[PDB]
Amino acid sequence: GKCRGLRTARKLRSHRRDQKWHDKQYKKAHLGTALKANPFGGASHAKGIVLEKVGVEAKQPNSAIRKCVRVQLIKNGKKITAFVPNDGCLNFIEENDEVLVAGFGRKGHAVGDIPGVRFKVVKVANVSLLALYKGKKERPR
Amino acid sequence: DSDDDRTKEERAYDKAKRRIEKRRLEHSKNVNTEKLRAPVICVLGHVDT
Amino acid sequence: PVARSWVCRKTYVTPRRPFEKSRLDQELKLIGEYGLRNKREVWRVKFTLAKIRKAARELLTLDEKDPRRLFEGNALLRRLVRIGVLDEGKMKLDYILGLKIEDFLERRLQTQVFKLGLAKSIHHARVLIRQRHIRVRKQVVNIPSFIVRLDSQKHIDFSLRSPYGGGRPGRVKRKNAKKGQGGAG
Amino acid sequence: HGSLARVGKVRGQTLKVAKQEKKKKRTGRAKRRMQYNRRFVNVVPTFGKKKGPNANS
Amino acid sequence: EGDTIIVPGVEGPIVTQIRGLLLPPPMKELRVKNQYEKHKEVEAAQGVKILGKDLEKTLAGLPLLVAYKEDEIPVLKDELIHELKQTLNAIKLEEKGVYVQASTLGSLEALLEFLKTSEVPYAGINIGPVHKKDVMKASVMLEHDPQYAVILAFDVRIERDAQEMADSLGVRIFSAEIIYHLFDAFTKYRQDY
Amino acid sequence: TVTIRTRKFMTNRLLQRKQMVIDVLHPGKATVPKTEIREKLAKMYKTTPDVIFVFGFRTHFGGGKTTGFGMIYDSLDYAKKNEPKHRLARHGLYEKKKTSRKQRKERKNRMKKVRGTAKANVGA
RNA sequence: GACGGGGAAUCAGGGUUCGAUUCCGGAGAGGGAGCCUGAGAAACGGCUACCACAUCCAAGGAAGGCAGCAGGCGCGCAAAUUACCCACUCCCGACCCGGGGAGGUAGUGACGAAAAAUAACAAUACAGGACUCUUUCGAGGCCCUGUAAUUGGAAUGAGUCCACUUUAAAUCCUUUAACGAGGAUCCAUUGGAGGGCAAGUCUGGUGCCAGCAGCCGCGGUAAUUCCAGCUCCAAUAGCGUAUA
């Protein structure tokens, strides 16, 4: 504290108000631009339809082909890319199918060596990928 | 004992299945030859008849 | 506008350290020694001890000759000597802070049934409690976490309907006797 | 080989090893009794470094 | 009314619970504007209307079994899935094509047979009124060969907001109450495109 | 054997009955039926058992303690005056009309739709 | 992405975030406008016109507003019975007597909270530990402790099913008959095992491919990190993931 007086409270309150506004994490949650630019719209999960199965590549140190999918949303129609999580689950996803899309867990940031992804696939055709991986549910037709 | 199968869920429905088939089979036994149901008149044809 | 209660509270608390070797060793030593089931019961014993210690600290913060401090301290001390964790000799407000977990876990029903002299092991005592055998003052109690008091200490006995305290024989004895009578007659 | 973009190849070409008929592990209160016995009853005074519970040297 | 029935569906058999039995007056037909009555039990040789809570995918012309027992595990539908695994006349090829929509399953199947004879694929088989979801799925197919980016709606009304969103990004709805007028409109659209 | 003990006994001159709390002791056996408490209170207070109304018997945990209430009237018509109808139905003294609420509400609405004397014949 | 407050979560001390939500007050019944009656209304389960949507119509006309209780559509990541009763708590009326989707009761229900099964005992198998001596053998092991698909009787519960009890009538709980377990097949899952961070330098397959990985990083034909088996570790009827 700099202004240390007995009847100095509105100066301290206003100064801390502007210095609280002059931040990054608090300013991200108190402006509508970050929420409107977010394709989820402040939601935890989201639905969408598969357009095509793409393959993106890793970064400089490690070399692999991380296989993803291009999904366009239900609620607004934004076009995102989502990473199919586990091994060999790209057979379970076909084109023009409903998927449930969630984040990675770094609050809208790229995770690991995959560039540009912020989303991952939890369910396809209203059945979970874990049951399909473990041979517990079958894809209806 | 060793008479039945290993688990219970793949045999407990067999009692229900045999109950259903004996209930329907007896339902095919005691039948009345008079005062039956209503049949279906089934109208077919061409355009503008 | 319905007529319900909606009043509840959590009785345990999860520790800040999920993986600490000494804490897990001490908790497993307590579980094995005092015949517990899992970590939630020793955590709830720790939680109620922490509440008692916090209340004693808040009472000891205030000065003497206060009616609120004197009344609440006398009520807390009388309740603790009624439960059986203290005695009349250590009848002070500042002696509450020297109490430990095993002083509370000694007053459990399972340990008292084991150490009174009618059960073989503490696990056998818990099994015997859970199958409706042990009663206190003509009341069948089938739960091991029953904190007995000092005045109800000398009234732990088998129930009247149990075969151990004198009653009808159980299912295995009657079935085996029926098999013996069928084979011999 | 086949292709570089073959999905799920290592899951599909690995050998299948069946499960083993093992005894039912007791769960609940007596598992903690077994843990307490094996940790703090059967302990032997050793020297140097104590091996882990899964130390398969 | 206190029993569970098993109806065949698109995604295999589905088990429901009966809610009511709507019966028309004997003077009128079953295609009447909401003039029905409620009954607890019905006599034999009657045309009733069983309504439930969640079916939304059913194939007609197939038997239904009334289970007087408790369906504690889905194994009492084994004879029914054995009956549906043979004689599948209406094979549902869920390919990538025109999103079709009709008020009735029979009219929808007739539209699918028209598209099959016209060598046009179909994607969606939704029954009922046209909503924002169907227009949005047509907008999904507005990329990657947008020739089949139309909604075929027959004898059913589109909502106002669905048309309002459809004209914004260019989804065509061939709403027609006459089936051959709809056929001629689709053929003229294909020729002009 | 089965014995009962009264508790919180009081008389009510202004309502012509007597309130009490009944503590049934049945060790070994199950909960006794209410006719046993009725005839026991009949031969306990030297009264005809047609005016003994008992209810609210809940068996305690432990097998042998049962707590319930009891009304001891001085007359049969006085018991008919100040009593709920379901207890008299339980003793077989009162009968209720067997019509559900939906039929009554629909009949009320159908009589509401028409005026005059036709209300008598629109609802049977 | 503001109904206000009593309050809620986190919480040494100070603070931060939420409060549509059972109690109080305010506002509306598609949204504006106007009014009759009545003590009390700008009322909408009252009326009169406008716009948007919309029902029947023999086409001249007529009848409407579930942000009440059930239910349906859409919207979505997101939310239950088109049940029974006025018996309890109260409310309105000429009035002990009628009515109340106010309310109570049951069904769905892993939002969440509390208690609490999935085992104990006895003898031999074979491993230790304590006692004067036998320094080291082995016995004494009368007092033990552990675990071994060796054996043996003695217990009660989940479930089926009579009665009793509860209740407006049931159902639920409690009591109680008769049956009800040895590999007690009456079978406990969810994550993880390089470090953070508790726990294999075990055995097979791929070879910077497939994949793992919140972060460092791991895969290049001997992988303590991939895919499977065995063992182990953390919590336990619960555990993992995503967002504020």
Side-chain angles (χ1 to χ4, degrees):
Chain A
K2 192 63 66 184
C3 182
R4 194 191 325 268
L6 194 48
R7 53 201 283 174
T8 69
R10 73 174 75 256
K11 168 72 176 182
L12 290 184
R13 222 181 61 229
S14 301
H15 172 254
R16 184 70 60 241
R17 195 186 295 128
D18 318 302
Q19 294 304 314
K20 189 175 301 183
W21 206 240
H22 204 147
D23 209 345
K24 161 161 270 170
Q25 313 153 240
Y26 164 100
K27 200 178 173 69
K28 201 160 62 50
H30 288 61
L31 283 190
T33 63
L35 271 299
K36 284 156 198 152
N38 181 221
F40 271 14
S44 170
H45 295 252
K47 278 195 192 311
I49 313 187
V50 159
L51 270 77
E52 63 185 2
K53 296 187 282 290
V54 297
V56 302
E57 291 206 58
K59 284 195 301 179
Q60 159 73 239
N62 54 3
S63 66
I65 301 175
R66 314 293 174 177
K67 295 177 174 65
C68 305
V69 62
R70 277 269 283 192
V71 177
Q72 183 214 20
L73 277 296
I74 301 299
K75 51 175 74 173
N76 66 15
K78 301 206 163 82
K79 299 173 67 62
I80 62 170
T81 178
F83 166 65
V84 181
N86 205 317
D87 185 74
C89 287
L90 212 50
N91 313 317
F92 297 147
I93 288 151
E94 295 184 354
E95 291 166 350
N96 292 39
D97 291 331
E98 191 256 0
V99 293
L100 180 70
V101 181
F104 275 99
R106 266 198 55 173
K107 272 81 187 182
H109 288 289
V111 165
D113 49 354
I114 302 92
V117 68
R118 291 95 62 91
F119 314 100
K120 84 170 178 182
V121 161
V122 168
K123 294 171 55 184
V124 62
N126 304 287
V127 65
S128 66
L129 289 174
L130 282 72
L132 265 63
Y133 193 90
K134 284 191 288 281
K136 296 174 73 173
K137 292 277 271 158
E138 311 295 339
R139 190 190 224 263
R141 177 190 59 178
Chain B
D1 65 325
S2 70
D3 213 1
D4 53 275
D5 205 356
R6 321 282 81 77
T7 55
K8 194 156 63 180
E9 69 275 16
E10 62 191 355
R11 188 181 61 82
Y13 80 103
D14 286 332
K15 179 183 280 189
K17 172 172 55 54
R18 80 162 62 92
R19 186 177 325 252
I20 286 302
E21 67 94 20
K22 74 204 196 73
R23 174 224 305 274
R24 77 151 170 281
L25 186 71
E26 289 152 31
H27 200 196
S28 62
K29 287 205 62 49
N30 298 114
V31 70
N32 303 117
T33 61
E34 191 274 331
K35 195 200 49 65
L36 272 77
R37 56 181 171 83
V40 182
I41 297 89
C42 183
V43 173
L44 311 173
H46 190 68
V47 190
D48 291 331
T49 68
Chain C
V2 296
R4 313 292 167 86
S5 59
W6 314 304
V7 180
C8 48
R9 52 154 44 96
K10 190 177 269 188
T11 58
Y12 61 93
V13 64
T14 45
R16 268 281 320 277
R17 286 306 207 276
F19 308 114
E20 202 185 60
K21 189 67 76 69
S22 56
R23 188 192 43 82
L24 294 174
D25 282 17
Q26 183 35 31
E27 277 169 0
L28 188 139
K29 177 161 285 272
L30 275 179
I31 284 184
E33 181 206 320
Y34 278 133
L36 277 297
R37 190 168 64 108
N38 45 7
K39 300 286 179 76
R40 282 189 298 183
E41 313 192 355
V42 65
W43 284 340
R44 88 196 177 191
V45 169
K46 184 186 306 303
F47 187 66
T48 180
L49 193 143
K51 291 173 79 72
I52 285 172
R53 288 266 318 276
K54 190 193 149 106
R57 189 192 326 196
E58 171 56 340
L59 271 193
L60 269 161
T61 300
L62 319 175
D63 71 20
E64 292 107 0
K65 292 182 184 178
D66 215 14
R68 186 189 93 85
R69 172 197 155 147
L70 277 165
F71 175 56
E72 289 195 52
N74 278 23
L76 182 49
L77 258 61
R78 194 81 41 210
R79 198 190 305 115
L80 290 174
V81 305
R82 189 176 98 228
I83 286 302
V85 67
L86 274 192
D87 62 358
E88 290 68 20
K90 294 173 295 189
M91 192 46 158
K92 283 287 297 184
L93 188 58
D94 60 356
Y95 283 40
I96 304 306
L97 313 176
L99 275 301
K100 308 189 248 153
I101 311 287
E102 321 86 351
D103 291 331
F104 263 70
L105 279 174
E106 181 256 319
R107 299 297 308 171
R108 205 176 170 96
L109 185 61
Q110 173 181 358
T111 76
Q112 286 271 16
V113 172
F114 159 72
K115 79 209 294 164
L116 193 143
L118 61 84
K120 270 80 71 176
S121 177
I122 187 158
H123 306 263
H124 171 256
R126 188 184 181 106
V127 166
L128 211 68
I129 283 170
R130 270 298 310 179
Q131 274 142 10
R132 313 156 47 82
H133 293 108
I134 294 91
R135 57 161 187 82
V136 293
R137 262 194 195 148
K138 305 170 305 282
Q139 172 67 31
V140 172
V141 184
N142 55 355
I143 44 176
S145 64
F146 179 80
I147 312 297
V148 286
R149 301 167 186 168
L150 292 180
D151 49 316
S152 179
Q153 182 65 42
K154 53 212 192 283
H155 299 91
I156 302 178
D157 186 74
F158 306 104
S159 62
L160 276 297
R161 300 297 310 272
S162 79
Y164 307 103
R168 292 207 54 240
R171 199 185 77 193
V172 193
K173 173 70 172 294
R174 282 183 284 106
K175 173 197 173 189
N176 279 359
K178 272 145 51 159
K179 288 197 297 291
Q181 290 156 7
Chain D
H1 292 269
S3 177
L4 278 183
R6 205 194 137 192
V7 298
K9 55 180 286 186
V10 70
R11 185 170 148 86
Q13 65 183 357
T14 182
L15 73 164
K16 304 288 316 283
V17 181
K19 288 291 303 183
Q20 263 184 40
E21 191 96 350
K22 44 192 61 53
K23 196 161 54 54
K24 181 177 72 69
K25 274 192 261 283
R26 44 161 70 81
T27 66
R29 188 205 71 254
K31 192 156 55 55
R32 296 294 186 181
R33 154 147 168 186
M34 185 180 288
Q35 287 191 0
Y36 170 72
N37 281 306
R38 187 152 42 68
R39 295 268 163 78
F40 291 163
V41 165
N42 281 359
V43 61
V44 57
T46 52
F47 54 92
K49 42 198 173 161
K50 308 150 291 315
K51 45 194 181 143
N54 216 40
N56 62 6
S57 295
Chain E
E1 305 214 71
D3 54 33
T4 66
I5 62 171
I6 302 105
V7 181
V10 180
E11 68 275 16
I14 46 174
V15 64
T16 61
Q17 213 274 310
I18 183 173
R19 175 174 293 171
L21 296 92
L22 262 63
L23 276 77
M27 185 225 78
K28 49 188 65 64
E29 289 218 61
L30 272 296
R31 41 205 167 110
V32 67
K33 165 33 161 53
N34 295 117
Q35 191 79 4
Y36 300 105
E37 72 181 3
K38 264 168 209 163
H39 287 255
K40 172 79 169 179
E41 51 93 18
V42 290
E43 302 292 326
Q46 281 293 324
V48 286
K49 292 188 76 165
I50 306 309
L51 73 165
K53 43 165 302 182
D54 210 318
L55 309 99
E56 68 91 20
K57 303 272 209 277
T58 45
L59 280 76
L62 277 296
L64 62 93
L65 183 63
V66 176
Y68 313 91
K69 50 164 288 292
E70 298 290 328
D71 195 74
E72 62 187 9
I73 188 167
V75 292
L76 269 298
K77 58 205 68 172
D78 62 358
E79 81 293 327
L80 188 153
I81 196 59
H82 192 18
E83 192 271 332
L84 276 71
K85 64 186 294 269
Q86 60 211 68
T87 65
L88 182 52
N89 306 106
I91 307 106
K92 302 287 100 175
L93 276 76
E94 293 283 345
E95 45 184 352
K96 177 255 290 180
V98 177
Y99 200 99
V100 65
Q101 200 163 358
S103 65
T104 310
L105 189 66
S107 301
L108 189 147
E109 286 190 301
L111 267 174
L112 294 174
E113 290 281 344
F114 166 76
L115 290 171
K116 166 169 309 300
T117 52
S118 175
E119 289 111 311
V120 176
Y122 59 95
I125 61 170
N126 178 254
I127 184 167
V130 182
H131 311 290
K132 282 169 63 70
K133 189 175 181 178
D134 304 330
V135 187
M136 195 293 309
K137 291 192 179 177
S139 299
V140 176
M141 182 146 183
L142 183 63
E143 292 181 353
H144 68 76
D145 188 70
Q147 168 189 170
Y148 312 127
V150 298
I151 297 288
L152 287 198
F154 162 69
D155 204 73
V156 65
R157 50 166 267 278
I158 53 182
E159 291 136 1
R160 179 62 52 78
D161 62 358
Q163 180 64 79
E164 182 176 359
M165 183 179 72
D167 186 74
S168 70
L169 76 171
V171 165
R172 182 79 170 276
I173 296 91
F174 297 99
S175 64
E177 293 88 7
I178 289 299
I179 181 163
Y180 46 91
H181 277 188
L182 180 137
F183 287 171
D184 291 331
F186 186 56
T187 314
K188 190 252 192 181
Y189 164 74
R190 187 68 146 281
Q191 189 61 227
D192 284 359
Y193 183 73
Chain F
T1 189
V2 177
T3 54
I4 62 170
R5 271 296 296 171
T6 177
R7 199 180 59 187
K8 286 184 177 177
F9 184 78
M10 62 98 78
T11 179
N12 216 330
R13 284 291 81 201
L14 61 84
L15 182 83
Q16 298 96 19
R17 69 176 191 181
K18 286 176 294 299
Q19 280 83 233
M20 61 205 317
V21 178
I22 300 168
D23 303 298
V24 184
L25 294 174
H26 45 65
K29 266 79 72 176
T31 308
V32 298
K34 288 199 289 181
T35 180
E36 172 36 53
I37 307 85
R38 278 177 57 205
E39 66 183 1
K40 186 69 193 299
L41 279 179
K43 67 187 174 184
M44 183 177 176
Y45 278 121
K46 276 82 65 179
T47 311
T48 304
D50 291 331
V51 298
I52 318 294
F53 296 88
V54 293
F55 59 96
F57 281 84
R58 307 221 197 217
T59 302
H60 279 165
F61 207 102
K65 293 166 173 210
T66 305
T67 315
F69 302 143
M71 301 315 148
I72 307 300
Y73 284 88
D74 298 355
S75 171
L76 172 44
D77 62 358
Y78 273 131
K80 270 190 182 67
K81 284 303 291 294
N82 43 48
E83 194 71 28
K85 296 185 284 287
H86 64 267
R87 284 210 269 276
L88 297 185
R90 281 190 211 170
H91 286 173
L93 193 43
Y94 177 69
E95 203 86 20
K96 294 150 95 73
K97 192 181 289 183
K98 302 317 266 175
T99 312
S100 53
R101 298 172 73 252
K102 296 293 286 300
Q103 313 184 20
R104 283 203 291 110
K105 288 165 176 297
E106 281 168 346
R107 174 191 311 310
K108 165 179 61 177
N109 282 303
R110 286 193 233 102
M111 292 180 183
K112 195 184 303 184
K113 293 288 280 294
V114 65
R115 63 180 292 165
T117 315
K119 294 182 186 287
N121 46 62
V122 68

